[PDB]
């Protein structure tokens, strides 16, 4: 078939949608699925993983045994409810004996595992954990997730307002905390309780998280409400964990009680209750003792689950690969991907035949593909100089789609200072045809004309740009990368905004151009575009000099974090510099809109033309 397996291998998408999509060949088993997924992620501790299946409307859960083939698994469950109300998630179930230490040396797992626990914390107990706790744990994730943001960042009103009003505090703290307490007050608490977690790197935040959490949430063991006994029955909470084996208790608070160490389980057996109710009957045989320790579950399903667990642990505590449970060509498992909504309608109209393009010389070097210059011959019309953007690893089916997504967007745009889309060639290898800006890249152009480009032409470029940006701001499109490197010159008196491509996924940077919230929290809005335009004006006014020449990249973060700003360029009017510094207002909401910058530059233009 295939089948969507949710998991916890981090990715810069909304966490709910973290999966892999696996095409399986017929008698492929659960082991096989799992085996592929963890190898995508360079996992060492492979034995620790399992595959759980749950309905959505009902909260019962099924642990799928390694050997059970996926095929007979789908059939036997999905013989009741549609594949849409079934969710398969990979998880960590069988923990080794020093598991945190162990995982320290298995980064992907330690991460997977953190992500796993957090989620259960968020779902099960966060909303009634002690309140300094929610605070601390919340802080730890903040500290972890934004591993690039300076430790004192949250002392700035507006930084916090990005979290609160843009990212969502619900992402880090439980619902009850947030609405039980005054926004203004909450700000301060968070501020104070972050102080201590300010200098912790990622790994350390995770360990502190566990260390803080465990004392009040026991993710190290799994507890069960079940009756023990043979024909004589008593009532307990069974406890299975790597550090104790198999304990019970009833008591109140006082000590639990050992039953059996995993290195002692001879065999595992599970029937339905051979009597009145279909209760879960689990039959553990223990080294020495001729009495098979009987356990009674409230359902077979729960019996199945407990069996899995123990079985998992025995297959672990001993180097074994195969079951401790009594038994009453074609392991294809390719990792694929997306089944997205098709490309919007659509090309019939801006389709170009490849025979109508002569592909000349190379002029630019992209990530996903090169940019060449060429001739285009529409026979109704004369030859045309064009830019052609070509795709490198062309037949990665969804790489192609993300590619010519760029062509779709460019189709919606029509503006004197944004590079026209001429057409597309949608067949591998896909090309996109755009107008060719002959005088090329702005930086170089300025550098070369440093002593023959008057101040007036300089502000013209700035203006021309701002119009392009306003145009885009109006169409709610965020560019994410405004810099002279990205601006072409079609003419001595004419620049055009270029690019509009994708950088997914995720990935992980033009720091020296970046709005601080981009650097701290990875938000990119129109306001950060205004920031970057700021730097871009500077660049222009500095005749293509790089902001912060010879300045190291965490040196820049701090400079700016403190209050430093790029110096007033030589022979830049004082208004325009005033206009730049507004763009570099730290707090986003204080920067002007492009529509407003357009208007200023316009008048700064006229004044400077007449004087
Ligand atoms: C970082 N500067 C590069 C200069 C070069 O190649 C790049 C990769 C970049 O220009 C935006 N480039 C694009 C990237 C993505 C979409 C469109 C273009 C693009 C385009 C052109 C272009 C040119 C050059 N570069 C161009 C382009 C260098 C020489 C002048 C012409 C172009 O003329 N139309 C689109």
């Amino acid at each position: 078939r295939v089948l969507k397996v949710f998991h916890y291998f981090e990715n810069s998408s909304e966490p709910t949608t973290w999966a892999s999509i696996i095409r399986h060949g017929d008698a492929t088993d659960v082991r096989g699925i799992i085996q592929k997924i963890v190898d995508c992620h360079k996992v060492k501790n492979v034995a620790c993983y399992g595959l759980r299946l749950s309905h959505l409307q009902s909260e019962e859960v099924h642990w799928l045994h390694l050997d059970m083939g996926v095929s007979n698994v789908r059939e036997k469950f999905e013989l009741a409810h549609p594949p849409e109300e079934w969710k398969y998630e990979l998880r960590i179930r069988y923990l080794p004996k020093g598991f945190l230490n162990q995982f320290t040396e298995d980064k992907p797992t330690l991460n997977f595992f953190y992500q796993q626990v957090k989620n259960d914390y968020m779902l099960e107990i966060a909303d009634q954990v002690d309140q300094e706790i929610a605070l601390k744990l919340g802080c730890l994730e903040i500290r972890r997730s934004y591993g690039e943001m300076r430790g004192n960042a949250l002392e700035k009103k507006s930084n916090y307002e990005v979290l609160e009003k843009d990212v969502g505090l619900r992402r880090f703290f439980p619902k009850s905390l947030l609405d039980s307490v005054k926004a203004k007050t909450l700000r301060k608490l968070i501020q104070q309780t972050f102080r201590q977690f300010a200098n912790l790197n990622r790994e350390e935040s995770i360990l502190k998280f566990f260390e803080i959490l465990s004392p009040v949430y026991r993710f190290d063991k799994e507890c069960f409400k079940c009756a023990l006994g043979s024909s004589w029955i008593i009532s307990v909470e069974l406890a299975i964990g790597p550090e104790e084996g198999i304990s019970y208790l009833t008591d109140k608070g006082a000590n639990p009680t050992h039953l059996a160490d995993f290195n002692q389980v001879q065999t595992i057996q599970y029937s339905n209750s051979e009597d009145k109710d279909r209760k879960g009957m689990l039959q553990l045989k223990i080294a020495g003792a001729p009495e098979p320790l009987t356990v009674t579950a409230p359902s077979l399903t729960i019996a199945e689950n407990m069996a899995d667990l123990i079985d998992g642990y025995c297959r672990l505590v001993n180097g074994a690969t195969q079951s401790f449970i009594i038994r009453p060509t074609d392991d294809y498992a390719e990792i694929i991907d997306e089944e997205d909504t098709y490309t919007m309608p659509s090309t019939r109209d801006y389709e170009i035949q490849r025979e109508r393009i002569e592909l000349g010389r190379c002029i630019g070097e992209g990530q996903f593909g090169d940019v060449h210059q060429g001739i285009y011959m529409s026979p109704e019309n004369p030859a045309m100089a064009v830019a052609i953007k070509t795709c490198k690893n062309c037949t990665s089916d969804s790489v192609r789609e993300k590619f010519l997504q760029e062509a779709l967007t460019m189709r919606q745009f029509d503006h004197p200072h944004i590079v026209k889309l001429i057409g597309v060639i949608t067949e591998n290898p896909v090309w996109i045809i755009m107008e060719l800006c002959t005088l090329g890249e702005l930086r170089s152009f300025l550098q070369v004309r440093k002593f023959s480009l008057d101040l007036a032409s300089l502000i013209l470029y700035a203006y021309q740009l701002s119009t392009a940006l306003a145009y885009l701001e109006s169409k709610r499109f965020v560019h994410r990368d405004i810099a002279a490197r990205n601006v072409l010159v079609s003419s001595n008196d004419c620049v055009k905004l270029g690019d509009f491509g994708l950088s997914r996924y995720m990935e992980d940077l033009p720091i020296k151009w970046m709005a601080p919230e981009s650097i701290n929290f990875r938000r990119f809005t129109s306001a950060s575009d205004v920031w970057m335009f700021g730097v871009c004006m500077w660049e222009i006014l500095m005749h293509g000099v790089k902001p912060f020449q010879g300045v190291k990249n965490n040196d820049v973060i701090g400079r700016i974090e403190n209050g430093e700003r790029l110096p007033m360029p030589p022979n830049c009017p004082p208004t325009l510099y005033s206009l730049m510094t507004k763009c570099w207002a730290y707090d986003p909401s204080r920067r002007p809109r492009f529509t407003e910058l357009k208007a200023q530059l316009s008048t700064i233009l006229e004044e400077e033309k007449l004087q």
Side-chain angles (χ1 to χ4, degrees), residues 1-56 58-74 76-254 256-393 395-611:
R1 222 266 120 19
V2 36
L3 145 102
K4 199 195 213 182
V5 181
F6 289 90
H7 62 252
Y8 297 106
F9 297 113
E10 272 193 68
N11 149 34
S12 90
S13 70
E14 202 77 284
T16 48
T17 76
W18 292 340
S20 334
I21 312 84
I22 317 86
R23 206 193 284 186
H24 56 304
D26 191 317
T28 298
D29 62 340
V30 160
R31 177 184 284 98
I33 304 290
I34 287 154
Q35 189 166 139
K36 286 301 203 184
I37 311 168
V38 313
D39 285 359
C40 266
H41 305 282
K42 323 297 196 77
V43 158
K44 291 176 186 178
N45 296 272
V46 188
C48 307
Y49 292 80
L51 197 59
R52 189 178 81 178
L53 170 60
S54 182
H55 204 272
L56 308 183
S58 163
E59 308 151 40
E60 57 136 64
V61 109
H62 292 85
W63 284 96
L64 320 161
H65 197 40
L66 297 176
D67 317 295
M68 271 311 193
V70 185
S71 331
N72 329 3
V73 167
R74 244 247 191 61
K76 92 159 150 81
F77 284 104
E78 190 161 312
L79 229 155
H81 314 291
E84 326 144 28
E85 9 194 336
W86 286 119
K87 180 174 150 168
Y88 292 73
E89 58 187 284
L90 191 70
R91 304 168 66 86
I92 291 167
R93 209 190 194 198
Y94 337 98
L95 298 164
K97 223 100 111 81
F99 57 90
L100 283 195
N101 273 197
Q102 183 102 324
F103 289 167
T104 276
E105 331 188 302
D106 200 8
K107 255 57 84 150
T109 299
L110 169 102
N111 273 96
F112 184 112
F113 187 56
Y114 166 68
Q115 293 305 337
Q116 176 163 318
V117 178
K118 179 147 81 51
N119 183 35
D120 301 355
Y121 160 72
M122 285 310 317
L123 274 19
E124 306 210 61
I125 48 134
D127 237 60
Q128 65 266 313
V129 82
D130 181 72
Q131 219 216 49
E132 240 109 294
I133 303 290
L135 284 183
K136 286 182 172 207
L137 302 186
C139 275
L140 289 159
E141 174 60 16
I142 293 192
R143 178 67 277 198
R144 187 210 66 89
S145 187
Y146 294 114
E148 215 71 55
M149 80 144 195
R150 292 267 265 78
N152 61 4
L154 301 189
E155 315 269 306
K156 272 90 152 186
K157 259 202 188 64
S158 64
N159 275 327
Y160 178 90
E161 297 176 39
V162 173
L163 292 188
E164 168 202 301
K165 199 159 291 187
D166 298 295
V167 159
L169 295 177
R170 90 218 75 178
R171 261 93 181 271
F172 319 99
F173 307 96
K175 197 175 77 79
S176 68
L177 206 203
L178 307 192
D179 18 82
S180 63
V181 88
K182 249 201 155 161
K184 286 172 201 154
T185 285
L186 176 63
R187 196 212 293 124
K188 188 158 179 192
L189 289 172
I190 292 186
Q191 293 194 340
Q192 304 168 342
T193 121
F194 187 87
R195 293 260 157 86
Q196 52 183 320
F197 312 127
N199 305 307
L200 277 59
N201 82 23
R202 293 186 191 86
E203 171 165 305
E204 287 154 340
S205 311
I206 304 175
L207 304 189
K208 198 69 158 188
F209 183 97
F210 281 130
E211 170 195 338
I212 281 155
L213 166 67
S214 108
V216 81
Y217 183 57
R218 295 191 86 7
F219 55 76
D220 43 285
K221 54 182 211 166
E222 278 182 54
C223 305
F224 299 92
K225 271 167 177 203
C226 58
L228 273 190
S230 317
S231 303
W232 3 283
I233 277 161
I234 53 97
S235 224
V236 286
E237 168 185 293
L238 247 234
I240 304 168
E243 309 275 18
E244 47 275 287
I246 310 168
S247 305
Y248 75 90
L249 64 92
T250 337
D251 303 288
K252 20 201 184 68
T257 312
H258 192 50
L259 298 152
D261 270 319
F262 301 117
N263 68 351
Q264 288 191 77
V265 189
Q266 229 159 353
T267 91
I268 302 158
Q269 169 117 30
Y270 60 178
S271 55
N272 70 103
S273 192
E274 29 265 302
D275 38 73
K276 196 263 186 177
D277 180 41
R278 340 148 199 223
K279 265 167 156 48
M281 190 98 302
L282 191 72
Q283 285 283 7
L284 309 173
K285 199 166 167 157
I286 276 78
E291 295 82 20
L293 160 57
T294 321
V295 198
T296 328
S299 69
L300 155 104
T301 253
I302 308 214
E304 270 202 46
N305 291 340
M306 295 173 71
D308 176 71
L309 191 44
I310 310 149
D311 180 51
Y313 269 116
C314 310
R315 142 259 271 67
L316 199 97
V317 144
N318 319 255
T321 78
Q322 36 34 254
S323 229
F324 275 81
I325 302 167
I326 61 96
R327 309 155 95 205
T329 321
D330 264 322
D331 46 300
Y332 178 101
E334 193 178 73
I335 33 99
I336 66 161
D337 34 48
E338 310 158 337
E339 279 192 22
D340 266 318
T341 175
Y342 292 89
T343 169
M344 283 278 294
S346 86
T347 76
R348 265 177 210 169
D349 294 351
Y350 56 102
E351 277 286 20
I352 299 189
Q353 311 102 288
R354 195 170 266 136
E355 335 103 43
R356 283 192 185 328
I357 313 284
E358 264 169 18
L359 171 81
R361 171 225 312 168
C362 174
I363 76 197
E365 273 181 336
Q367 290 184 291
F368 284 121
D370 295 334
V371 185
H372 299 86
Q373 136 188 122
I375 324 290
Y376 165 50
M377 291 128 279
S378 65
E380 285 176 315
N381 299 152
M384 250 208 44
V386 293
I388 301 135
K389 180 154 164 190
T390 76
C391 189
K392 205 175 304 304
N393 272 339
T395 78
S396 320
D397 283 322
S398 102
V399 168
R400 189 189 76 143
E401 262 178 61
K402 290 218 156 201
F403 203 83
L404 85 164
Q405 206 108 187
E406 161 180 18
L408 310 202
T409 42
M410 257 193 263
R411 224 311 162 122
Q412 317 312 302
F413 299 155
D414 183 55
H415 192 275
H417 299 302
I418 293 173
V419 17
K420 247 87 182 175
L421 177 65
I422 289 142
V424 282
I425 298 174
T426 79
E427 318 202 296
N428 310 325
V430 173
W431 297 348
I432 301 176
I433 318 301
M434 20 203 14
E435 83 193 2
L436 174 61
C437 305
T438 268
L439 305 178
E441 19 206 353
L442 183 56
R443 275 195 77 214
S444 177
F445 169 88
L446 296 176
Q447 253 134 291
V448 159
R449 268 145 273 242
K450 207 225 170 198
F451 292 119
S452 52
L453 268 178
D454 54 317
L455 177 67
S457 343
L458 295 177
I459 105 196
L460 174 57
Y461 304 147
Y463 173 79
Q464 309 212 319
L465 253 259
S466 73
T467 83
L469 296 153
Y471 172 71
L472 296 170
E473 160 183 272
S474 78
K475 293 192 152 180
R476 285 152 143 181
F477 172 101
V478 171
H479 181 105
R480 279 154 112 103
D481 202 15
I482 300 168
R485 74 186 161 267
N486 275 321
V487 187
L488 316 162
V489 180
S490 104
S491 165
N492 50 44
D493 67 325
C494 186
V495 304
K496 300 188 139 160
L497 219 211
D499 165 79
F500 317 97
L502 267 95
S503 46
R504 296 6 136 176
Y505 224 47
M506 359 316 304
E507 119 280 333
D508 177 35
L509 267 186
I511 290 311
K512 306 199 197 162
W513 283 253
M514 292 172 65
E517 70 279 17
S518 307
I519 307 181
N520 295 313
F521 304 103
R522 302 179 230 102
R523 292 286 311 326
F524 293 84
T525 64
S526 278
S528 56
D529 277 8
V530 179
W531 175 287
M532 292 190 143
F533 179 63
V535 181
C536 192
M537 282 185 293
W538 188 99
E539 275 179 295
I540 295 183
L541 259 303
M542 283 290 317
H543 301 274
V545 165
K546 279 187 196 184
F548 309 117
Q549 302 217 300
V551 185
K552 277 181 191 174
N553 271 6
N554 292 15
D555 292 346
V556 168
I557 77 170
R559 285 199 182 181
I560 301 225
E561 201 58 9
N562 281 103
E564 272 85 292
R565 294 294 183 269
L566 278 130
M568 190 174 91
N571 282 300
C572 177
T575 329
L576 180 52
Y577 189 66
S578 159
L579 198 47
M580 297 179 199
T581 44
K582 276 173 209 189
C583 306
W584 307 322
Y586 191 90
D587 171 342
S589 71
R590 274 153 185 275
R591 299 171 201 148
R593 303 305 232 79
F594 284 99
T595 179
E596 160 56 14
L597 290 148
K598 174 182 168 167
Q600 288 279 287
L601 286 153
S602 184
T603 87
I604 293 180
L605 178 77
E606 307 331 327
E607 146 69 15
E608 174 64 10
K609 284 216 213 87
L610 303 178
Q611 311 148 328

PDB file of all heavy atoms in Angstrom, residues 527-541:
ATOM      1  N   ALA A 527       7.559  43.545   8.154  1.00  0.00           N
ATOM      2  CA  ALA A 527       8.320  44.479   8.961  1.00  0.00           C
ATOM      3  C   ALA A 527       9.805  44.169   8.865  1.00  0.00           C
ATOM      4  O   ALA A 527      10.636  45.080   8.743  1.00  0.00           O
ATOM      5  CB  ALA A 527       7.854  44.441  10.390  1.00  0.00           C
ATOM      6  N   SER A 528      10.130  42.879   8.902  1.00  0.00           N
ATOM      7  CA  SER A 528      11.505  42.428   8.718  1.00  0.00           C
ATOM      8  C   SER A 528      11.969  42.757   7.307  1.00  0.00           C
ATOM      9  O   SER A 528      13.146  43.042   7.094  1.00  0.00           O
ATOM     10  CB  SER A 528      11.651  40.934   9.017  1.00  0.00           C
ATOM     11  OG  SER A 528      10.763  40.163   8.234  1.00  0.00           O
ATOM     12  N   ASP A 529      11.046  42.746   6.347  1.00  0.00           N
ATOM     13  CA  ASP A 529      11.394  43.202   5.009  1.00  0.00           C
ATOM     14  C   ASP A 529      11.781  44.681   5.021  1.00  0.00           C
ATOM     15  O   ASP A 529      12.771  45.052   4.408  1.00  0.00           O
ATOM     16  CB  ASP A 529      10.304  42.869   3.973  1.00  0.00           C
ATOM     17  CG  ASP A 529      10.420  41.423   3.429  1.00  0.00           C
ATOM     18  OD1 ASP A 529      11.237  40.625   3.963  1.00  0.00           O
ATOM     19  OD2 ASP A 529       9.690  41.078   2.469  1.00  0.00           O
ATOM     20  N   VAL A 530      11.032  45.511   5.750  1.00  0.00           N
ATOM     21  CA  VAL A 530      11.411  46.921   5.946  1.00  0.00           C
ATOM     22  C   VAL A 530      12.791  47.042   6.615  1.00  0.00           C
ATOM     23  O   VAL A 530      13.647  47.804   6.151  1.00  0.00           O
ATOM     24  CB  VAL A 530      10.355  47.723   6.740  1.00  0.00           C
ATOM     25  CG1 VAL A 530      10.800  49.161   6.931  1.00  0.00           C
ATOM     26  CG2 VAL A 530       9.012  47.707   6.042  1.00  0.00           C
ATOM     27  N   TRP A 531      13.021  46.280   7.681  1.00  0.00           N
ATOM     28  CA  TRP A 531      14.352  46.241   8.252  1.00  0.00           C
ATOM     29  C   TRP A 531      15.405  46.038   7.177  1.00  0.00           C
ATOM     30  O   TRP A 531      16.314  46.850   7.053  1.00  0.00           O
ATOM     31  CB  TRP A 531      14.518  45.134   9.282  1.00  0.00           C
ATOM     32  CG  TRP A 531      15.942  45.064   9.748  1.00  0.00           C
ATOM     33  CD1 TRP A 531      17.016  44.599   9.045  1.00  0.00           C
ATOM     34  CD2 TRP A 531      16.453  45.508  11.001  1.00  0.00           C
ATOM     35  NE1 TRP A 531      18.157  44.711   9.784  1.00  0.00           N
ATOM     36  CE2 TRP A 531      17.843  45.264  10.994  1.00  0.00           C
ATOM     37  CE3 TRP A 531      15.871  46.084  12.138  1.00  0.00           C
ATOM     38  CZ2 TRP A 531      18.666  45.579  12.075  1.00  0.00           C
ATOM     39  CZ3 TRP A 531      16.692  46.397  13.218  1.00  0.00           C
ATOM     40  CH2 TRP A 531      18.074  46.141  13.176  1.00  0.00           C
ATOM     41  N   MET A 532      15.289  44.936   6.426  1.00  0.00           N
ATOM     42  CA  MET A 532      16.288  44.528   5.443  1.00  0.00           C
ATOM     43  C   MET A 532      16.410  45.526   4.311  1.00  0.00           C
ATOM     44  O   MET A 532      17.473  45.664   3.716  1.00  0.00           O
ATOM     45  CB  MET A 532      15.905  43.212   4.801  1.00  0.00           C
ATOM     46  CG  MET A 532      15.927  42.006   5.670  1.00  0.00           C
ATOM     47  SD  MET A 532      15.716  40.602   4.557  1.00  0.00           S
ATOM     48  CE  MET A 532      16.797  39.405   5.343  1.00  0.00           C
ATOM     49  N   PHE A 533      15.311  46.187   3.984  1.00  0.00           N
ATOM     50  CA  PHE A 533      15.347  47.234   3.003  1.00  0.00           C
ATOM     51  C   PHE A 533      16.211  48.357   3.546  1.00  0.00           C
ATOM     52  O   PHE A 533      16.936  49.026   2.798  1.00  0.00           O
ATOM     53  CB  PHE A 533      13.936  47.736   2.718  1.00  0.00           C
ATOM     54  CG  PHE A 533      13.877  48.857   1.718  1.00  0.00           C
ATOM     55  CD1 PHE A 533      14.294  48.665   0.404  1.00  0.00           C
ATOM     56  CD2 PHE A 533      13.412  50.109   2.091  1.00  0.00           C
ATOM     57  CE1 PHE A 533      14.233  49.705  -0.526  1.00  0.00           C
ATOM     58  CE2 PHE A 533      13.351  51.148   1.172  1.00  0.00           C
ATOM     59  CZ  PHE A 533      13.755  50.945  -0.139  1.00  0.00           C
ATOM     60  N   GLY A 534      16.133  48.556   4.857  1.00  0.00           N
ATOM     61  CA  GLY A 534      16.944  49.561   5.516  1.00  0.00           C
ATOM     62  C   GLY A 534      18.384  49.332   5.142  1.00  0.00           C
ATOM     63  O   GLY A 534      19.021  50.193   4.548  1.00  0.00           O
ATOM     64  N   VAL A 535      18.876  48.144   5.465  1.00  0.00           N
ATOM     65  CA  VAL A 535      20.236  47.752   5.154  1.00  0.00           C
ATOM     66  C   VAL A 535      20.489  47.903   3.663  1.00  0.00           C
ATOM     67  O   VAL A 535      21.581  48.292   3.232  1.00  0.00           O
ATOM     68  CB  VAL A 535      20.500  46.296   5.547  1.00  0.00           C
ATOM     69  CG1 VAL A 535      21.917  45.934   5.235  1.00  0.00           C
ATOM     70  CG2 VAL A 535      20.218  46.069   7.026  1.00  0.00           C
ATOM     71  N   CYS A 536      19.474  47.612   2.869  1.00  0.00           N
ATOM     72  CA  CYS A 536      19.663  47.681   1.442  1.00  0.00           C
ATOM     73  C   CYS A 536      19.920  49.102   0.968  1.00  0.00           C
ATOM     74  O   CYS A 536      20.819  49.322   0.169  1.00  0.00           O
ATOM     75  CB  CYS A 536      18.507  47.061   0.689  1.00  0.00           C
ATOM     76  SG  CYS A 536      18.963  46.883  -1.001  1.00  0.00           S
ATOM     77  N   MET A 537      19.141  50.058   1.464  1.00  0.00           N
ATOM     78  CA  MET A 537      19.426  51.477   1.229  1.00  0.00           C
ATOM     79  C   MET A 537      20.850  51.841   1.624  1.00  0.00           C
ATOM     80  O   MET A 537      21.566  52.469   0.852  1.00  0.00           O
ATOM     81  CB  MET A 537      18.447  52.365   1.983  1.00  0.00           C
ATOM     82  CG  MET A 537      17.082  52.488   1.310  1.00  0.00           C
ATOM     83  SD  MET A 537      15.987  53.660   2.149  1.00  0.00           S
ATOM     84  CE  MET A 537      15.685  52.810   3.708  1.00  0.00           C
ATOM     85  N   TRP A 538      21.263  51.435   2.819  1.00  0.00           N
ATOM     86  CA  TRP A 538      22.625  51.668   3.264  1.00  0.00           C
ATOM     87  C   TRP A 538      23.606  51.170   2.219  1.00  0.00           C
ATOM     88  O   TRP A 538      24.407  51.952   1.721  1.00  0.00           O
ATOM     89  CB  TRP A 538      22.872  50.968   4.588  1.00  0.00           C
ATOM     90  CG  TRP A 538      24.185  51.306   5.228  1.00  0.00           C
ATOM     91  CD1 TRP A 538      24.401  52.211   6.224  1.00  0.00           C
ATOM     92  CD2 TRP A 538      25.460  50.725   4.931  1.00  0.00           C
ATOM     93  NE1 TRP A 538      25.731  52.236   6.564  1.00  0.00           N
ATOM     94  CE2 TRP A 538      26.404  51.335   5.785  1.00  0.00           C
ATOM     95  CE3 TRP A 538      25.892  49.747   4.031  1.00  0.00           C
ATOM     96  CZ2 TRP A 538      27.757  51.001   5.764  1.00  0.00           C
ATOM     97  CZ3 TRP A 538      27.230  49.412   4.009  1.00  0.00           C
ATOM     98  CH2 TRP A 538      28.152  50.037   4.873  1.00  0.00           C
ATOM     99  N   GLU A 539      23.528  49.872   1.894  1.00  0.00           N
ATOM    100  CA  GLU A 539      24.309  49.250   0.817  1.00  0.00           C
ATOM    101  C   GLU A 539      24.362  50.154  -0.397  1.00  0.00           C
ATOM    102  O   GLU A 539      25.439  50.491  -0.869  1.00  0.00           O
ATOM    103  CB  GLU A 539      23.706  47.900   0.407  1.00  0.00           C
ATOM    104  CG  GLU A 539      24.133  46.693   1.252  1.00  0.00           C
ATOM    105  CD  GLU A 539      23.472  45.369   0.813  1.00  0.00           C
ATOM    106  OE1 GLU A 539      22.226  45.226   0.925  1.00  0.00           O
ATOM    107  OE2 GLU A 539      24.207  44.459   0.361  1.00  0.00           O
ATOM    108  N   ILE A 540      23.199  50.560  -0.893  1.00  0.00           N
ATOM    109  CA  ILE A 540      23.140  51.418  -2.063  1.00  0.00           C
ATOM    110  C   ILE A 540      23.899  52.714  -1.823  1.00  0.00           C
ATOM    111  O   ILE A 540      24.683  53.156  -2.665  1.00  0.00           O
ATOM    112  CB  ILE A 540      21.686  51.739  -2.478  1.00  0.00           C
ATOM    113  CG1 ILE A 540      20.978  50.451  -2.930  1.00  0.00           C
ATOM    114  CG2 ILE A 540      21.645  52.852  -3.563  1.00  0.00           C
ATOM    115  CD1 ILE A 540      19.559  50.640  -3.424  1.00  0.00           C
ATOM    116  N   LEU A 541      23.667  53.309  -0.657  1.00  0.00           N
ATOM    117  CA  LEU A 541      24.293  54.567  -0.288  1.00  0.00           C
ATOM    118  C   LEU A 541      25.769  54.406  -0.015  1.00  0.00           C
ATOM    119  O   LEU A 541      26.519  55.372  -0.092  1.00  0.00           O
ATOM    120  CB  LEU A 541      23.595  55.180   0.929  1.00  0.00           C
ATOM    121  CG  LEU A 541      22.595  56.317   0.675  1.00  0.00           C
ATOM    122  CD1 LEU A 541      23.259  57.473  -0.069  1.00  0.00           C
ATOM    123  CD2 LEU A 541      21.362  55.841  -0.079  1.00  0.00           C
TER     124      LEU A 541
END
